[PDB]
Amino acid sequence: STSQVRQNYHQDSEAAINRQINLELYASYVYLSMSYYFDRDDVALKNFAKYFLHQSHEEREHAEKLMKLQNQRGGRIFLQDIQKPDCDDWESGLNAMECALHLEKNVNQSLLELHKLATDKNDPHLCDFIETHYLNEQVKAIKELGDHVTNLRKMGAPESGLAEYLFDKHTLG
């Protein structure tokens, strides 16, 4: 049953990796939903749409890298349902950015718990995988989203549709 390549890879780490794969795919689905919300004719913020679509693809890449990790270590991928996002209607550019920030912080928390598990299981390869490919990415993404939220709020979003328009043009464009 044991993979010929498997070495120093705890069952709990394998399971946590599978959970993280699902979470990354979920985040990719959330961002896809947000993108096409901004593609609606009654919202019509193309650069918001582009931004979130890019994020969706990035999240898919993160999931695929975790799957590659899983196979590299000799764990076995078990996929689960990708739950639909919490919203169909994301209400505003600002609200979407706030939800994205919340999502990214939740993903970061899951990564931190993964790192803690790796450390506890004395899995330095896994620890450094997480550190190299995920943790800084998360910190950067959270910082960027926080900057966006700050700018939108200062501009007067979401009540100032001019605010969101000009943010779409000048920041995301």
Nearest CB to a second copy, comparing residues 19 and 125: 125
Name the segment binding Mg ion (CB under 5 A); options: 6-14, 74-82, 116-124, 129-137: 129-137
Shortest distance (Å) from residue 142 CB to a second copy: 5
Closest residue to bound Na ion by CB: 62
Which is closer to a second copy, CB of 12 or CB of 120? Answer: 120
What's the maximum distance between 2 C-alpha atoms anywhere in the chain? 61
In whole angstroms, the minimum distance from the beta carbon of 164 to Na ion comes to 25
Measured from the CB atom, the residue of 62 and 73 that comes closer to a second copy is 73
Per partner kind, with CB cut-offs from 5 to 8 A, the member of Na ion, a second copy, Mg ion, none near residue 116 is a second copy
Q: Which helix (H) or strand (E) holds 148?
A: helix 136-155
CB of 62 to Na ion, least distance (A): 4
Contact 55, 31 (CB under 8 A): yes
If one counts every other C-beta atom within 10 angstroms of the C-beta of residue 77, the result is: 14
Q: Quick check: 124 binds a second copy (CB under 8 A)?
A: yes
Q: SS3 for 117? A: helix
- Smallest Cα–Cα separation from 20: which of 58, 55, 63? 63
For the chain, give the number of residues. 173
Tell me if 113 contacts Mg ion by CB under 5 A.
no
Among 59, 98, 164, 168, binds Na ion (CB under 5 A): 59
Cα angle at 68 between 67 and 74, to 5 degrees?
90
Is 91 a binding residue for a second copy by CB under 8 A? The answer is no
Binding-site residues for Fe cation? 24, 59, 62, 104, 138
Phi then psi for 20, rounded to 5 degrees?
Answer: -65, -40
> If you ran DSSP here, which 8-state letter would residue 132 be given?
I
Contact residues for Mg ion, defined by CB under 5 A: 128, 131
